[PDB]
Amino acid sequence: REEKQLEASLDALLSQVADLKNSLGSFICKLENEYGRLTWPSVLDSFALLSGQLNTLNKVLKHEKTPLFRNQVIIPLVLSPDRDEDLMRQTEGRVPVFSHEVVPDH
Amino acid sequence: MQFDHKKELRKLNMSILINFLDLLDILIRSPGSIKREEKLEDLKLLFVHVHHLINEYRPHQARETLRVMMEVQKRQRLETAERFQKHLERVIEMIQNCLASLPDDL
Amino acid sequence: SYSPTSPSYS
Amino acid sequence: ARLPSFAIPYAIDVLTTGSYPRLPTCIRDKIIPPDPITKIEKQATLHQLNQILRHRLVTTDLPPQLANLTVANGRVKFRVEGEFEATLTVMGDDPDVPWRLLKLEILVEDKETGDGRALVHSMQISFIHQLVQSRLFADEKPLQD
Amino acid sequence: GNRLRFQLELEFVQCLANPNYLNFLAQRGYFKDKAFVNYLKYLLYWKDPEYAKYLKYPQCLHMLELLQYEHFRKELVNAQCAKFIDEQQILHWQHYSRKRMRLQQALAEQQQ
Amino acid sequence: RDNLLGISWVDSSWIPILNSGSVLDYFSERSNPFYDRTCNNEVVKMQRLTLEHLNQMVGIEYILLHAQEPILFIIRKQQRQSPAQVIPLADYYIIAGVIYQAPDLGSVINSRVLTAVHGIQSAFDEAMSYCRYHPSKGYWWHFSSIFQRQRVDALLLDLRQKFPPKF
Amino acid sequence: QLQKQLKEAEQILATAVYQAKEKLKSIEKARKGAISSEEIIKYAHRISASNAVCAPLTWVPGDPRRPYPTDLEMRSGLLGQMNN
Amino acid sequence: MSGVRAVRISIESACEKQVHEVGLDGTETYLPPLSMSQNLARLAQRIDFSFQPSLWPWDSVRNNLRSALTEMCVLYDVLSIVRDKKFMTLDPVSQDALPPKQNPQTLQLISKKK
Amino acid sequence: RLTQLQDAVNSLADQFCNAIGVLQQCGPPASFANPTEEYAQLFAALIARTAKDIDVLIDSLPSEESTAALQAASLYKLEEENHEAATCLEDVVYRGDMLLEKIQSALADIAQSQLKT
Amino acid sequence: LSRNEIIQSYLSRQSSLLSSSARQLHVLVPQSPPTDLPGLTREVTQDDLDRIQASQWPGVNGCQDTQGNWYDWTQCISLDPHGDDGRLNILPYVCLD
């Protein structure tokens, strides 16, 4: 019931984070590939649109009758120093082989 | 101070084994004796000396191995000097043969 | 199993 | 009470000098970038390259129609006076190192045809440069070729 | 007094051989101050034999030299840096010792 | 005591002697920021033995939730109104003999968004400082083909065919 | 052919004298190096008395014995104790 | 031994082989080839003829944006790891972030002001 | 050999403690087993082996004809000979450098003539 | 601490034997009545210094062994004290890399 709704809100949040990440990445990559010819109107045109839209969307999503997020808690289950080829694929290359360092760090 | 380091090491080896046999005689005859405490101290002192001689064969393993070390370095320097001497002779012979072939052909 | 690894796990 | 190995040379190294020659150097190779050579070094290396170029030239059959070569302390400067300017050089050991064309300036510069310009697109010059460079990289018989 | 100065400096230099403490100082921003680089330059007096005679943990000296390159302090703020450096240090140590031992023993057993 | 989420407490001796039975004791070592004297597991230790007394009593009972034998040992803080009535307060997880408090799914995200956007804002202010404008010049920072090239490209292909590349 | 042979001989000479210069560099470090042996023995005993110079016989990937002063030794260590 | 006399003993540095890189699970690596005859050409490679691409201007801006992107990515990774029950949890411990002050009003005010 | 001898002596002490702790903890009860008798024979054999090995490493270990006196004399002679060998080798390197300088200039002139022709 | 499983006990034998290991045993070395410094008071005798550098001294410069093979401190001695296939493995003294 509320768990289904909570999962829906979580997926929406995931979507928002993914979009923001993609935008930031594209922006910095474009900066590095353009360097020259880039001018203040365009740089302002890109920074403002990406940040404003994504941030406003995230805050809006967090505050629209979604489950209470301070309630839930995240406590690691199993840690195995084994090589994992699925977590490396799932997190798109960062955070492979869920070791001991990674849970205090993240 | 006769301090032979091999005779006294053999003596301390044999003394360790015979005091182990006498500790077995303690455990056979009178386990409640006072002497076993002395005996469980006694061979401890013997073991200390067997380490303390071979350490002293260790500022000597140091000074004696150090002695071999320096001799080996001197031998390597002599070998490199001999290789240079031989290499120089080979080069001089090469120059001489090449020069004869120049005017001999002339 | 999995003791904290000072050298990497073999 | 037992010592390990009695340090053997570890103690000697610290007292004699200081540069720890133990563990891994990958620390410095991955974290610290190398310092560039000064001009004194530059001149010495270019003089060594001059000697190597002299040897390579006296070994290679330089074309006899022009072959205007000057060591220039780093580059043979193969330059026909009015037709072409190439700068070939070597990269290492004389037996099997390839050549490096480096410069492909075109000498045909008319002031009656091309006013305030060259005579051919730079991109085509770089294309010819890379082509002839890959052709010389085969270690065939380059001075004639 | 000069005795307390000597003792505290010895403890600090011996403590610098810890990658965890180095990452601690780098993250806390102590390296960015131009005072700490001068303090490090002053700390080079330990290279002398009379001062190196009192160093129990000698692994620090070499590390100290790296801290002078001015690129070692800009990096190392990462935890992966401390991870990798401590990995290589302990690997050199243990592998050198136990590998010499095992190589000698295995060769002596196989040649027989 | 400033922020319990931002504190970590440890002890080396207890580290090798750690087992599913001793996890509660490690949390109980005292002088540990996460656990408290008020907890009843502490009142029990003052008395003799420990059994179904946490159910006879119904109060602050730190209890192990999930356990991996080598390192992972999660602890949960419960407040019982009566037997068969449990209210979860918080979760403290021990990784590699290092105790942390489980972050809320939302406090963590709030701090995370704040740091990222603060970085973006510093970058933006810095970028705004440098941009300089004039109407005549346009924007700047504070820091072709002569079309005779088709014949040149024909000659390039001709010399390619004549002198083949021998990479 | 003579020129080529001469060049090969030159390369040989170069490598040989470069190695000789390396030996000379060692000799220059060695000259300043000479010191008391007893002092070397004492320093070796100092650096080798603990688990610093030699890895322990039974030292697997998981030991309080560290190549640095741990953290409990630091907690009682003069450094921060006196800075406090 | 009764009163050992220390003499001027000179020892040469024991640099016969260096371990440039040390891999995991043993496997020693002796990268150092101890050469010079080729090292002259190796240094000639360093010689000129004419830190990321350029990276002299906008370095601060570039690093700041990179760091922001990295934090965003880490949060996304944790959220994707919660998206499933693989090595993770989501148990909602019925708690309540109780703020014992008028923090909200003051914070809002100061924030808006700056 | 020294660390081998140290480990052999420690293995002797460990075999002592292990032998008593085995042969007192485990035994057939009495009468007013065979595995225990086998254990005793094996332990006695191991202790005897270890003793023989320690003796061989020691019959081997240095004769007390060092550790003092000869050490100082040898290190002093080695210092003198290191100095004289350094001088001899630097002289040889001087000869080689002169020869290489001669051959380098001897060619350069060949190359100059061949380019001038 | 119960152990005593046939498998657990069998592991103990292999581990202990590995660390430890027709005579092929070293030649017996007897009493050393004249030590070079205290015993014979022959400190800095030039013959002793010459003997250690090149001559074979049975215990100062090496281990004689039986069968005549001479093993210097740096070398590793392989010997077979028990009458069995398994051979004891003496390791090096200088162990100088």
Picking from J37, J38, J97, the nearest residue to H14 by CB comes out as J97
Report the DSSP pairing between strands D84-86 and F98-101: unpaired
Using a CB-CB cut-off of 8 Å, the residues of chain F touching G70 are: 12
Using a CB-CB cut-off of 8 Å, the residues of chain A touching C5 are: 81, 99-100
Question: Does any CB of chain C come closer than 8 Å to the CB of residue E105?
Answer: no
What's the N-to-C CA distance of chain J in angstroms? 41
Which tokens sit at F166?
A: 């021998």
How far apart are alpha carbons G84 and E8 in whole angstroms? 12
Q: Which residues pair with F94 in a beta bridge?
A: F73, F99
**Mutate: best of F12, F14, F31, partner G, most G CBs <10 A:** F12
Phi/psi for J65 (5° steps) reads 75, 180
Give one DSSP letter per residue of H33-100, joined into a string: ---STTHHHHHHHHS-----SS-SSSHHHHHHHHHHHHHHHHHHHHHHHHSSSTT-------------
Give one DSSP letter per residue of F65-76, joined into a string: EEE-SSS-EEEE
Q: Count of alpha carbons within 13 Å of A29, Cβ hemisphere only?
A: 6
State whether C2 and F97 contact (CB < 8 Å): no
Query: Who contacts D97 (Cβ-Cβ below 8 Å, separation ≥6)?
Result: D90, D91, H41
Write the CA distances from F29 to D1, F63, G17, integer angstroms: 35, 15, 68
Question: Does any CB of chain D come closer than 8 Å to the CB of residue F145?
Answer: yes
State whether H11 and B3 contact (CB < 8 Å): no
Residue type, E103: L
Q: Chain F, 5-64: which have a CB under 8 Å from a chain G CB?
A: 12, 15
CA F150 to chain centre: 60
Question: Does any CB of chain G come closer than 8 Å to the CB of residue C7?
Answer: yes
Question: Does any CB of chain H come closer than 8 Å to the CB of residue A50?
Answer: no
Q: Which residues pair with G35 in a beta bridge?
A: H9
Dmax (CA) of chain E: 64
Min distance B64 CA to chain I CA atoms (Å): 7
How many CB atoms sit inside 10 A of residue J68's CB?
A: 7
Question: Does any CB of chain E come closer than 8 Å to the CB of residue H24?
Answer: yes
Min distance A68 CA to chain C CA atoms (Å): 36
Residue with tokens 């990321």: H52
Residue type, F79: Q
Containing H/E element for F86? strand F85-95
Q: Count of alpha carbons within 13 Å of J76, Cβ hemisphere only?
A: 23
State whether J73 and B67 contact (CB < 8 Å): no
Question: Does any CB of chain F come closer than 8 Å to the CB of residue D124?
Answer: yes
Residue with tokens 């493995």: J89
Which tokens sit at I17?
A: 């403690």
State whether F71 and C1 contact (CB < 8 Å): no
Write the CA distances from J5 to I21, I23, J1, J10, J16, integer angstroms: 18, 18, 11, 8, 17
Min distance C7 CA to chain A CA atoms (Å): 12
Method used to solve the structure:
cryo-EM
Chain D residue with CA closest to J94: the answer is: D8
Chains D and J touch (3+ CB pairs under 8 A): yes
Q: Which long-range contacts (CB under 8 A, 24 or more apart) does A7-12 make?
A: A9/A61, A9/A66, A9/A67, A10/H79, A10/H82, A10/H83, A11/H83, A12/A61
Rounded to the nearest 5 percent, the helix, strand and coil shares of chain E are 75, 0, 25
Picking from G2, G17, G34, the nearest residue to I97 by CB comes out as G17
Contact I85, B74 (CB under 8 A): yes
Report the DSSP pairing between strands F132-134 and F138-140: antiparallel
Using a CB-CB cut-off of 8 Å, the residues of chain I touching B83 are: none
Q: Which residues pair with D105 in a beta bridge?
A: D85
Q: Nearest Cα to D142, choosing from D62, D54, D58, D68? A: D62
CA H14 to chain centre: 32
Report resolution in angstroms.
Answer: 4.2
Min distance G66 CA to chain B CA atoms (Å): 25
Residue with tokens 């180095």: E22
What value, to the nearest 5°, has the Cα angle with vertex J14 and ends J13 and J18?
120
**Would you give the DSSP letter of residue G35?**
B
Residue type, F45: K
How many CB atoms sit inside 10 A of residue A91's CB?
A: 19
Residue type, D130: Q
What value, to the nearest 5°, has the Cα angle with vertex G75 and ends G70 and G81?
140
Q: Nearest Cα to F15, choosing from G54, E89, A76, A100? A: A100
Neighbours of D (≥3 Cβ pairs closer than 8 A)? B, E, F, G, H, I, J
Contact A79, A98 (CB under 8 A): yes
Which tokens sit at A84?
A: 């994992």
Min distance F10 CA to chain D CA atoms (Å): 30
Which tokens sit at F117?
A: 């956007």
Chain E residue with CA closest to J76: the answer is: E108
Q: Nearest Cα to D129, choosing from F156, G8, A67, G31? A: F156
How many CB atoms sit inside 10 A of residue H98's CB?
A: 5
